[PDB]
Ligand binder design. Sequence first.
Ligand SMILES: [Mg+2]
Ligand SMILES: [Mg+2]
Ligand SMILES: [Mg+2]
Length: 430
Amino acid sequence: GPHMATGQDRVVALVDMDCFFVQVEQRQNPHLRNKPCAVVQYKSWKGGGIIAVSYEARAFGVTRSMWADDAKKLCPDLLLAQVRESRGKANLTKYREASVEVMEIMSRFAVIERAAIDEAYVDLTSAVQERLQKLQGQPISADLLPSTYIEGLPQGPTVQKEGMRKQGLFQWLDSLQIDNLTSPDLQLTVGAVIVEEMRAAIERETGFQCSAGISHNKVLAKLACGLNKPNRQTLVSHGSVPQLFSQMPIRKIRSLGGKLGASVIEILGIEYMGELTQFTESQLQSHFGEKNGSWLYAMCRGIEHDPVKPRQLPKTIGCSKNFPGKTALATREQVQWWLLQLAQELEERLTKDRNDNDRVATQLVVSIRVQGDKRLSSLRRCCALTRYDAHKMSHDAFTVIKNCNTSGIQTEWSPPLTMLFLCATKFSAS
DNA sequence: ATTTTGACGCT
Ligand SMILES: [Mg+2]
Ligand SMILES: [Mg+2]
Ligand SMILES: [Mg+2]
């Protein structure tokens, strides 16, 4: 009891831009605003592959990883914006630059960890301490939390969505003990006030709306963020965890959506995160390894210690192209031309990175796939990156892969290549 | 024939 650590030491937020690439295109083209629309890359094969979907289009069943032609079957009025194509390939620069806009706003409020192009974790512990001092024991008004849900409320003894939201927030604020500055529930509540202000700043200064989760760690913040989308934020308190986890499929927790979570389900014969509490830490370690076992033992109790890392910039700058079916590169000239295209985009992005961020990549990673291999990568080789020169980088990549050609013939490349990937890594200050 | 990314853990 008195020594049971409860994982209530931090306030952590996860901010997730709503249907991000779609909003970028809708800001640029007002005709797309408030319409079923999607972002598609390429157009020739089946109308293009959808990679982002507005909530209006999601209502028709349109999803990511859908061909545009099939999406149009579900949603005949679906509007489409195409990813830019440069040097023969999709180019995501517009979305990377929009991401920078949002990340730089978030960084004015607190230390952020860039988790993906459209999401960042925020460590709000210190900001919450400061705001609690500025308030002077003053109660927190519902008006400070106009888009916040309290997960698990209302409970106990209106039929509209905003009405339920307000009833739950009222119950929460009515229970709060605002005079105890060390109360974790109060700390989370102030965190949510700050996140309201952060999301308001993002929308005012970029036009982009986002959702957010506020809790005591990254996994719960991420889970909370998805509970009320779009354009809303959700507070998941420590006390809400038992009910929340009692019917939460294991695959919904970050890192359990794949083979490990499937093994948890199969080996333990359970379905819901909360069912994990009935195993000892040693039992979970025995099935899933020392680190996974300890992590699961604490996580099913709502506890995790993974820090919000101070990293606003990506650690790698990469570019890749698949060559599916019959487009597979079967000649040396082909391989060299496409290595050059990838290397030129990489050089452009690298030079911009060096100017903006005072750093230089030192390693070039080359990865290829050969036809007939279920693995995403068939071969991954590194070499030195000493000069931001596209021709040199393409030559080096060719040098490190050229012995993969099993063909005895001079030009022909066998087996044909279905993927090329150049990645700049190992940055150093400059 | 989703494609094009990005981070991290294992050995
Ligand atoms: Mg996201
Ligand atoms: Mg998103
Ligand atoms: Mg998504």
